Write a protein that binds this ligand. Structure first.
Ligand code: HPA
Ligand code: HPA
Lengths: 339, 339
DNA sequence: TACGCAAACGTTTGCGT
DNA sequence: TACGCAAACGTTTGCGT
């Protein structure tokens, strides 16, 4: 039950039991064995609580997420978790659903549980949230979802969402389109506003004007893709191509088109963004901008461990890069031959 | 920094600080305030480690999962998490990927971290795993993925996967089909073998014989749905309808059909299972058996808390029930008018 | 050579007066 | 009335001899 119970069965001091258990000093074989034996019948399981109390670190990390079911998110989380495990850390998952109160709560429970570091993925960063976060500059942390380093008291991994938005637009332009519409994600997020603007730069470069009736705000959820695609194609004049800010929303856009009798890409070309695991099996196989979700995770974890173990003080930031994945949802547009 | 530092700034004993902080006894207003004030400048955050060491419970639960990205899983996890939070518990997520070693590791780290209870979702339960689990009968636990109560030392929530398999088959039969094929999930799992057998009972009842070339094993992953659908339709004689053991695999089956030029449901009818959040937005909107994922989570959490707080000793088991969701992937079969 | 003493980590709580 | 003493929870680790 307790180290004391073990030391006693083994007839050695607890100081000894602890040394064999942690190979922190040489112990006579025979001695070791005895301890192991006792450890065994006693069915001892050392208390990490006790230990952490003395050693001052819990070997545990907290993820302050937005939600965890959304494919995008879910893929990152599973990555972060992979890393913790292989480096002996334990993951504490907390979804704040973009709720300040919730954020304030989890943040606290976390601090109380004395997590060695914090991985932050809150989507939106209002001042109040930015404020609560600084109050914990003491806990080592890294934000994995900004496009620029919003603050000095944290590490940051940046996705170059603007560059990707730009890649998306260029591709459409290079395929022959000039009448393009867009369904962006929330402008309050990096993956929302960022991708959009990247996209819009390329349009401007090509002197392509995007009429406002062709821009419909989504929320990364499929229903939102569904309604937007519908509002776009449900009009007199419709674009020949659509840039959809997120794969899952795109999936929604695909379904509406089909329900309206439109053909993809024969009638409308569709390009998404994220390259979630199932994008290839959408119907038709989705052409999209890939976000390195795995590296985003691993890179974030690593910066954390650094700050952790190597007691780093300076905020760091590391970029990651998106890349176009051609599938079958895009077709040449009316101006292809003219380039 | 420490309770001691607070008691001192406040000029009261720590016994006092602790009482205000936990409202465990009456404290003079003025006294309270002082403590709060100190608590404030000191920027104190009570140590849960310390506390748990004394009180003997961590207010934290461990989820020994298989993986967390798969839509099915991801939806359950997000539910379990919702429950922990509203009941003040902290969630420790651990994916064992159906690996014994991994299982043995997480199980241990968990025990060491002294989690108040364990939510188990390992998919497959080989004796060796069944064995490791009993070694921890001491920690309160519930398995959320068996179809029958595999053991006495745990609580269990059962999904009635056989009943659902049977619902799926019946529907096809009632729609006019007699040439049906099936892509089941791994037979080593409840959601695999269970659904299949439910399905097969209905066939037998209808004297429908399922030729072996029409049964293709999947693994819940879309690629597997893709290959299987392909092997099924890639043959001389093909069924008019397909029962697909999991939505995500179904999504794969949908894509292959389209790629082979087949029409759903015009050429082939397809019925899935799970009713994952995006099934409605598949193309076409997927007809499937719904698994109450939310209730599965909440129900499991609740049984745990019970055993926890009410120190229950007896293994319990609670059933949950699936229900058919008609969408647009099924059409009447050749024998409809003949019934 | 190989191991043990005892203090400390940060809290909570029975008995007090 | 309203608060404090001090022991304990389960470990780790400096100094020993
Ligand atoms: O905020 C988001 N939510 C879901 N999917 C996403 N893909 C990019 N950003 C997001
Ligand atoms: O084991 C499974 N994996 C993924 N999805 C599933 N849906 C039912 N069972 C499963």
């Amino acid at each position: 039950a307790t180290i004391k119970d073990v030391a006693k069965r083994a007839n050695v001091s607890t100081t000894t039991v602890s040394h064999v258990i942690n190979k922190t000093r040489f112990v006579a074989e025979e001695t070791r064995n005895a301890v192991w034996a006792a450890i065994k019948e006693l069915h001892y399981s050392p208390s990490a609580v006790a230990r952490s109390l003395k050693v001052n670190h819990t070997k545990s990390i907290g993820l302050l997420a937005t939600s965890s079911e959304a494919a995008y998110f879910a893929e990152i989380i599973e990555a972060v978790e992979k890393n913790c495990f292989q480096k002996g850390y334990t993951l504490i998952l907390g979804n704040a659903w973009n709720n300040l109160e919730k954020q304030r709560a989890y943040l606290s429970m976390m601090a109380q549980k004395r997590v060695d570091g914090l991985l932050v993925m809150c989507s939106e960063y209002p001042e109040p949230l930015l404020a609560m976060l600084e109050e914990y500059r003491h806990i080592p942390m890294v934000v994995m979802d900004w496009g620029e380093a919003k603050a000095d008291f944290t590490d940051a991994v940046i996705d170059n969402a603007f560059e990707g938005g730009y890649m998306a637009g260029r591709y459409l332009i290079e395929r022959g389109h000039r009448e393009i519409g867009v369904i962006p994600g929330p402008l309050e997020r990096n993956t929302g506003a960022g991708r959009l603007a990247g996209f819009m730069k390329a349009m401007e470069e090509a002197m392509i004007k995007v009429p406002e009736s062709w821009i419909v705000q989504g929320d990364f959820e499929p229903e939102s893709g569904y309604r937007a695609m519908q509002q776009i194609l449900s009009q007199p004049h419709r674009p020949t191509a659509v840039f959809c800010g997120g794969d899952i929303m795109a999936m929604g856009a695909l379904c509406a088109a089909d329900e309206m009798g439109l053909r993809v890409p024969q009638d409308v070309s569709l390009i998404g963004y994220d390259n979630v695991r199932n994008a290839r099996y959408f119907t038709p196989a989705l052409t999209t901008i890939h976000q390195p979700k795995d590296s985003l995770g691993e890179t974030a974890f690593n910066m954390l461990l650094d700050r952790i173990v190597n007691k780093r003080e300076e905020p760091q930031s590391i970029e990651v890069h998106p890349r176009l994945i051609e599938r079958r949802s895009v077709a040449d547009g009316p101006f292809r031959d003219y380039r």
